[PDB]
Chains A and B, each alone.
Chain A
Amino acid sequence: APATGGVKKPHRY
């Protein structure tokens, strides 16, 4: 549950 940053993903449908 640590928060992350710099995750590459477009938006969900």
Chain B
Amino acid sequence: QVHLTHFELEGLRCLVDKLESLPLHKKCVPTGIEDEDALIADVKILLEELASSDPKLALTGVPIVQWP
């Protein structure tokens, strides 16, 4: 339903593959994160769902991540 840029979709896929494959002593899961495996799982689902983002509709001029 939201449209991400291909810049973001490709970058989030790189980032999830990167963080998932770091061993425990290099993963650096920070203090605020609850269950990082469930996070990795949710990101993969979301990337599948957003894979058909439309490139023109992604150009909203406002970032998807902003504070309320």
Physical contact A–B (CB less than 8 Å)? no
| B interface with A by C-beta (< 8 Å) | none
| A interface with B by C-beta (< 8 Å) | none
